Amino acid sequence: MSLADAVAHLTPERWEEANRLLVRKALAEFTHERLLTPEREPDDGGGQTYVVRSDDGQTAYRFTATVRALDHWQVDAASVTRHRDGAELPLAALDFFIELKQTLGLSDEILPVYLEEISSTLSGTCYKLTKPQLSSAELARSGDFQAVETGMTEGHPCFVANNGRLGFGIHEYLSYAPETASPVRLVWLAAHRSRAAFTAGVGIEYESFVRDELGAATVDRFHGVLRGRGLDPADYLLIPVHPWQWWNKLTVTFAAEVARGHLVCLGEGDDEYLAQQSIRTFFNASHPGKHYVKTALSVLNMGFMRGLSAAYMEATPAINDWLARLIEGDPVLKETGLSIIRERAAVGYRHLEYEQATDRYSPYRKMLAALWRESPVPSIREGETLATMASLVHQDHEGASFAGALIERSGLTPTEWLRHYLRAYYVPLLHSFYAYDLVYMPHGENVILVLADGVVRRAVYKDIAEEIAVMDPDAVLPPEVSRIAVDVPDDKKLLSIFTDVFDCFFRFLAANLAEEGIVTEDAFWRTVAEVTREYQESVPELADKFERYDMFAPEFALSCLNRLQLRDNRQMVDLADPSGALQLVGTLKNPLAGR
Amino acid sequence: SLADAVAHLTPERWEEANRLLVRKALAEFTHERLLTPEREPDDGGGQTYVVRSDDGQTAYRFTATVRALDHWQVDAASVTRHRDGAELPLAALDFFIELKQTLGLSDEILPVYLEEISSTLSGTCYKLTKPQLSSAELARSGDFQAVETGMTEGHPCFVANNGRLGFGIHEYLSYAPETASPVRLVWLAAHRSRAAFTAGVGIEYESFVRDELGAATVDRFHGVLRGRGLDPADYLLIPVHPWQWWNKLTVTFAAEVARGHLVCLGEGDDEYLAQQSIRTFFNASHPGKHYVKTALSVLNMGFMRGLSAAYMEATPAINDWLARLIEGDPVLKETGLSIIRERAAVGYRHLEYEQATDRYSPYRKMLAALWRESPVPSIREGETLATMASLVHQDHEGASFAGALIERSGLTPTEWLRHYLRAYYVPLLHSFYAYDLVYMPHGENVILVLADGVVRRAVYKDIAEEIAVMDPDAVLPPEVSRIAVDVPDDKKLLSIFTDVFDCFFRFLAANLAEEGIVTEDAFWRTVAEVTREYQESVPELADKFERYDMFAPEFALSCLNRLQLRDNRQMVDLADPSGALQLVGTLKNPLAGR
Numbered sequence A: 001m002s003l004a005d006a007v008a009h010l011t012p013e014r015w016e017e018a019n020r021l022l023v024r025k026a027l028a029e030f031t032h033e034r035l036l037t038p039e040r041e042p043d044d045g046g047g048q049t050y051v052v053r054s055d056d057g058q059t060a061y062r063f064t065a066t067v068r069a070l071d072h073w074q075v076d077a078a079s080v081t082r083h084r085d086g087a088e089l090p091l092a093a094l095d096f097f098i099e100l101k102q103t104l105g106l107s108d109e110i111l112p113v114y115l116e117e118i119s120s121t122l123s124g125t126c127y128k129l130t131k132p133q134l135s136s137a138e139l140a141r142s143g144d145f146q147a148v149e150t151g152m153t154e155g156h157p158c159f160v161a162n163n164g165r166l167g168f169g170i171h172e173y174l175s176y177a178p179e180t181a182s183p184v185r186l187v188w189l190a191a192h193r194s195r196a197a198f199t200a201g202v203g204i205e206y207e208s209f210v211r212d213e214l215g216a217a218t219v220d221r222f223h224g225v226l227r228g229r230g231l232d233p234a235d236y237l238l239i240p241v242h243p244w245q246w247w248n249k250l251t252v253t254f255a256a257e258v259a260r261g262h263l264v265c266l267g268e269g270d271d272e273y274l275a276q277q278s279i280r281t282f283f284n285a286s287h288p289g290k291h292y293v294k295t296a297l298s299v300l301n302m303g304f305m306r307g308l309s310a311a312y313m314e315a316t317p318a319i320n321d322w323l324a325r326l327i328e329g330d331p332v333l334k335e336t337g338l339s340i341i342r343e344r345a346a347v348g349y350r351h352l353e354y355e356q357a358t359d360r361y362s363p364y365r366k367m368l369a370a371l372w373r374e375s376p377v378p379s380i381r382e383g384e385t386l387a388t389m390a391s392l393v394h395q396d397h398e399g400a401s402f403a404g405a406l407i408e409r410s411g412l413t414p415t416e417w418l419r420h421y422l423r424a425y426y427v428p429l430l431h432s433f434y435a436y437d438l439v440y441m442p443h444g445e446n447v448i449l450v451l452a453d454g455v456v457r458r459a460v461y462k463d464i465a466e467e468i469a470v471m472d473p474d475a476v477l478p479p480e481v482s483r484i485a486v487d488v489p490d491d492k493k494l495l496s497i498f499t500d501v502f503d504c505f506f507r508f509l510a511a512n513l514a515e516e517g518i519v520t521e522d523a524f525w526r527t528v529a530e531v532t533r534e535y536q537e538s539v540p541e542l543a544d545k546f547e548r549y550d551m552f553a554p555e556f557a558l559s560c561l562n563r564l565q566l567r568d569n570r571q572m573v574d575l576a577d578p579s580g581a582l583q584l585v586g587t588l589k590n591p592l593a594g595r
Numbered sequence B: 001s002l003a004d005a006v007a008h009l010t011p012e013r014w015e016e017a018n019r020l021l022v023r024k025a026l027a028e029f030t031h032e033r034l035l036t037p038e039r040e041p042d043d044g045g046g047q048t049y050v051v052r053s054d055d056g057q058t059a060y061r062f063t064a065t066v067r068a069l070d071h072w073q074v075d076a077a078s079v080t081r082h083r084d085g086a087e088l089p090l091a092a093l094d095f096f097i098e099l100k101q102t103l104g105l106s107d108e109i110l111p112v113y114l115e116e117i118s119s120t121l122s123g124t125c126y127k128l129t130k131p132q133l134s135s136a137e138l139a140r141s142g143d144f145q146a147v148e149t150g151m152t153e154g155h156p157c158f159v160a161n162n163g164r165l166g167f168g169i170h171e172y173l174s175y176a177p178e179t180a181s182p183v184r185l186v187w188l189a190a191h192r193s194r195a196a197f198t199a200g201v202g203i204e205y206e207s208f209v210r211d212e213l214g215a216a217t218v219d220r221f222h223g224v225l226r227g228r229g230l231d232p233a234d235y236l237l238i239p240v241h242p243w244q245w246w247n248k249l250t251v252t253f254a255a256e257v258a259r260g261h262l263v264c265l266g267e268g269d270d271e272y273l274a275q276q277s278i279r280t281f282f283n284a285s286h287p288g289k290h291y292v293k294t295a296l297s298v299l300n301m302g303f304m305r306g307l308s309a310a311y312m313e314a315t316p317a318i319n320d321w322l323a324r325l326i327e328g329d330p331v332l333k334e335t336g337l338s339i340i341r342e343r344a345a346v347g348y349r350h351l352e353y354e355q356a357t358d359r360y361s362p363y364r365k366m367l368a369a370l371w372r373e374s375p376v377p378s379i380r381e382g383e384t385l386a387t388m389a390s391l392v393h394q395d396h397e398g399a400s401f402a403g404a405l406i407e408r409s410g411l412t413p414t415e416w417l418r419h420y421l422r423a424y425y426v427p428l429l430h431s432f433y434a435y436d437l438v439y440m441p442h443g444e445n446v447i448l449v450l451a452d453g454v455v456r457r458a459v460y461k462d463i464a465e466e467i468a469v470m471d472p473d474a475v476l477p478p479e480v481s482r483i484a485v486d487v488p489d490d491k492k493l494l495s496i497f498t499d500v501f502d503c504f505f506r507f508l509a510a511n512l513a514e515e516g517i518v519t520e521d522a523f524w525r526t527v528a529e530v531t532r533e534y535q536e537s538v539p540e541l542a543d544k545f546e547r548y549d550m551f552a553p554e555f556a557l558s559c560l561n562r563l564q565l566r567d568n569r570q571m572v573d574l575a576d577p578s579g580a581l582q583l584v585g586t587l588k589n590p591l592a593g594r
């Protein structure tokens, strides 16, 4: 049955494995965020047994872990056991959360919805366990950008409830989840110019842009659909839409717009897209050189509804143009090879009645918008391949690091390999901060690596307009881009590197490379220190600022990521409050300290 | 197919949908005293009124006839909208934004309520594309399900009444009653450690499910379980709304599917039609077989339409108790009253979600089903069935369906009304006065048995979850004592005044008067005669008749729309219905001085 087929990945054996992996990560990351304080229990062999108890005291979780730099808890999956009233019990993620509800600060309101997000994340793991199990070495050897993108399993390495996609029924999961590599056809709407606005970056004009993307034949067909209803194509702008968004939302929530002819259904476009790790961003699988399309998707994932703001679209291209120009202008960013793939164009729809009915923060203002982003594909030479930076912290079904496999392929020492990666990825971030007070959101999903023979040649940053900030409230910026100017205490500025790079990315990378015996934490962090010191030696003009915002400070604040989602799982940061949802809980030892 | 699904959404149908809904909004919100129209005298022969927005800048203008029970027959074709001196299109979303403060819609509720408005309008657009049958063709047809799927209005008080929120447009087309789309149920095997089946008198499980599905189907179901390593003895069968399977059970209850607490058995062979309640299915393949009522986590008219696993245990016993009571009472026998029983019920208890929520949680209403016997086997040659909701049906010409039953009968409007009141309304007087027992007897909970256009007898449904005994000291069989309630004495007769008079007869007497069929005076005269004739026939309750006075000058105006507007997600709250009631002054009882 297509009934039975749709749940064939939900079996006791895979459910067990899924629960073991998720509970392993719960113990590790909730210990990192100091929600749990595991108690040391009597010397087993040497490298350490621990116990975590329920709110109750009645249910015990025992495991082994190696504790690594940045208060990182490498909890052994195979070691986790559960005990109550003298007896062992099966590992069960739902029971974990009910049992540690108060320990974890889960409100009565959030718990039941959080458990849906857990339930959904576990299903996805079960789905991923049914797929062909490719080693880290096979995936590296493939050189296949979309094989890597869709082969990723973890998601965000910190958030536990990270792959919820709540709003997807099972059939929609199987059609739309990145890990399915299901081909998707975008739904195209005509949107009346009384309510839709198209914004073009330098070098973009609308009529040639849409003809390049859809082909002149499809544009002609769409013009015919409007003439057919007695409508003038000049009156309308083209908006591509996530099929989920069209069938579940715009046809109901925006029925008035469809009925009135403010919105007209044109059809599917021909090209087959693959959802990326972000879910609502599509890569063009038929024409890899064409643009990604970022769609409005009113689905809950990882602390936010994944809509797209019609208001932010107006400035989105200008912000990208400014960033690209700043990068071509800077000698250090040139040495580095840094580029972005620009958000090149954007369209937004202003639902006039919903604006009248909602504050400017409502998800109802984020139901209909899209932007186009350049493919990195046309920029690579022969011999080059592309990969999500997320791949560096990927471990295959045998625990083998994809970073490890790139090191193997490269023929370089681990530390030589790391120098090339850090020069490409990390040095731009240090220089953007010190020279321009510029920060990004540089996790695994927002960076693409260009690889030659297993070596990182250069990094490509994406997700620009909605993520970048300038940490100077009086920054002189072109009018259209000054909304990126933020006021942030001095106190918290360098947390952009310590939190987003060190605690939420390097911590996982150094640990996977240590556990697999490829390179010691000592040599990992020496290498970061050295590249850091060499960057600073090459720009003496910024000496004063290197001392003021010290990368080698003894300590910096623990910023907790799960704590945000546990306090509020629908908007885990108020996008309307002065960066002040951060949950800082004491300090971490800086691995760079004394270098 | 993309264009096919939105083909009902056109400017002309959307315009007509908005006109109808703003007409009803002006009407019912005026009835509930949220609006106070001003009289702009055209003559002094009455006629013409204005309502302003919260800011006073936008003016709504119409004509109405005010009838008994403060019923505002707002003429749909008269409604105009004006701002800064210019005419504007009637747009329902704009109506609600403009009167947000007047209507008491919170910042939190407004945007979700507007979705329910948008969805209600969409439905109207879709009903406007169906073959426009007249009340006379529908009444002549004798087709139970042509009538059921032929209704357009929905609840005649509630404006945001047909939202079905959580249906995507594809789901609207497959699942909404007005589509008459055949549905196949999805069958799950539910492990006995979490599922419990309960049977009324005369039901045993194994013969029951073979009767419903056939021996071959049950055998195949046993085959899917043995194929998987599982013993069929360990499992019960639960039928599920495919929406609930595809969107909720396969995701929210993923742990149950994966562990084999729930096993997917496939679709059932028989075709069902969604009834007006949306999650109750009539068996179109075998009309004589059971209705299936399903758990459906969608928002409609002030509630989620899930089904409580906890209430299923007592459902059949409450049904058996009411049937036996009806069978034993001479006044209820003379009336011809019967119920269609909720005969069987299964409930799933999700133990982890129990640990995580309080007993009121919708997480506990996600997997449960009951079976309700069909009325079809009980009818004789010459008899047809119709939802009581049809009496207040008006076709595309404004012609009352009740009117068309009167014409077919050859009876005077008044003779016709006696038969209807005897079958439907007397049993409600006798239940209150003799047993302190009330139902929820709106159009969707009553089926009429029809001979030659006449109401011969009435059949009640929605039983276990609706009925009350208004007496906390009632001695009732152990299983059925949860229907015992403490209601203040001064609110008891609101069961008749609110649910029958203000929420049904108000509409029926106005439709009949406006079409010129029979006057309000003669309508309410007949009601008063049948009330008096009931009371005369049972003199031992003379003292309860003076204590609960059906002919009192006045009773409280109980506002239905005010509840949905205060809370569109659970409009009646915790375990205290007598709690959320919004009483705003009084209505002139049309039985006053009779």
Ligand SMILES: Nc1ncnc2c1ncn2[C@@H]1O[C@H](COP(=O)(O)O)[C@@H](O)[C@H]1O
Pocket: A154, A155, A156, A157, A162, A163, A277, A278, A279, A301, A302, A390, A441, A443, A444, A445, A446, A463
């Ligand atoms: N490895 C990953 N790192 C970060 N985000 C990820 C990753 N894999 C998937 N995601 C998802 O991508 C989205 C990130 O959005 P943004 O933070 O704007 O880049 C969220 O929905 C994340 O759950």
Ligand SMILES: Nc1ncnc2c1ncn2[C@@H]1O[C@H](COP(=O)(O)O)[C@@H](O)[C@H]1O
Pocket: B153, B154, B155, B156, B161, B162, B276, B277, B278, B300, B301, B305, B389, B440, B442, B443, B444, B445, B462
């Ligand atoms: N004419 C009608 N009268 C009452 N309820 C109706 C009508 N048409 C549809 N319904 C729906 O039927 C359901 C009534 O549920 P209940 O009150 O428990 O029988 C609601 O979801 C109503 O919106």
Ligand SMILES: [Mg+2]
Pocket: A278, A445, A446, A463
């Ligand atoms: Mg992103």
Ligand SMILES: [Mg+2]
Pocket: B277, B444, B445, B461, B462
């Ligand atoms: Mg009902």
